Amino acid sequence: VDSRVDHLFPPSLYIFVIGVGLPTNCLALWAAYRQVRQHNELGVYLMNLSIADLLYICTLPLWVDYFLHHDNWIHGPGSCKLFGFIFYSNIYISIAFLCCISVDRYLAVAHPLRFARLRRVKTAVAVSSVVWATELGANSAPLFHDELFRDRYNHTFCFEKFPMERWVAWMNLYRVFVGFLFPWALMLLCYRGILRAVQSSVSTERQEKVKIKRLALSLIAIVLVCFAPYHALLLSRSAVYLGRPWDCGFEERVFSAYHSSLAFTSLNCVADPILYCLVNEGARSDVAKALHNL
């Protein structure tokens, strides 16, 4: 039952994220659709990443007023189960679909002559549906459990509880080791293979190989820069519990840094549209044509 200062950094970082990430993700979704209309399957995964980003962005204002009102959620019991679910599961949706994009690219570069069936529009939408269903189902655990967390320090605690309960900590261990590192490991392996397949390209000039290297490094470094503080803090905070649950010891001071690492996670919603629909020259041409059709 200890409170800190988390009312200026997250509250305005979310403002920046919303204001920059609604239009970029709308454009990314349009470019994804135009990729789909050309019988290219990458647009499907791009749509499924952009829709997650859009849901996160449109459910952010509940939390900008959750933090700006000084941890006060006067938006009711029912709302916290839904908007909180979206806000706490879009990161996992997004990382899963980023992993899908990386795996799709790897099969299309390292093995350009094989796996024809796995690279189609119908297969892409089937995999997309499977990923959405499985991720929502495995994040379903904090739905039934009615939060109803109030304390004697003028809080309201929408979806958050200090200290963690039994189920929240074991949920957080999954939320880290299966929702962050495993998709990250697959992403890194896939892009290392993609860069491995380019040194044997006679066609591409050495300048283009380094130009590909910079993107393939940024795409997996931004994941660290956006997610690693949050998940390292979550893992540490949970590991303190299971060794000594009754002591509100570590949760006393790392609270403010934990909320800051929660807010800072929300940059991998303006980062994704950039790296996946604006750095590319061809996709930017389609985006310009779209902006030139209005």
Peptide bond into 163 cis (omega under 30): yes
Could you tell me the CATH number of the domain that includes residue 56?
1.20.1070.10
Asked if the structure places residue 2 within a domain, the reply is no
* Cβ-Cβ contacts under 8 Å for 100 (sequence gap 6 or more): 45, 48, 127, 128, 131
Asked if the structure places residue 278 within a domain, the reply is yes
Residue 195 and residue 102 in contact, taking contact as beta carbons nearer than 8 Å: no
End-to-end Cα separation, the chain, in angstroms: 53
Calpha distance 106→230 (Å, rounded): 28
Calpha distance 64→68 (Å, rounded): 6
Calpha distance 229→59 (Å, rounded): 22
* Cβ-Cβ contacts under 8 Å for 149 (sequence gap 6 or more): 155, 157, 160, 161
What radius of gyration do the chain's Cα atoms show? 21
Three-state secondary structure call for residue 115: coil
Tokens of 115: 């796996």
Asked if the structure places residue 3 within a domain, the reply is no
- CA 246, 249, 250, 255 torsion-angle sign: positive
Q: Which of 63, 64, 68 lies closest to 79, judged by CA?
A: 63
The CB-side HSE value for 192 (13 A sphere, CA atoms) comes to 7
Q: Which of 175, 268, 264 lies closest to 218, judged by CA?
A: 268
Data resolution in angstroms: 2.8
Q: Which of 63, 70, 73 lies closest to 5, judged by CA?
A: 70
Three-state secondary structure call for residue 137: helix
Asked if the structure places residue 272 within a domain, the reply is yes
Query: What is the signed CA dihedral for 204, 101, 83, 171, rounded to 10 degrees?
Result: -120
Asked if the structure places residue 249 within a domain, the reply is yes
How many independent structural domains does the chain possess?
1
Angle between helix 77-109 and 121-138 (nearest 10): 140
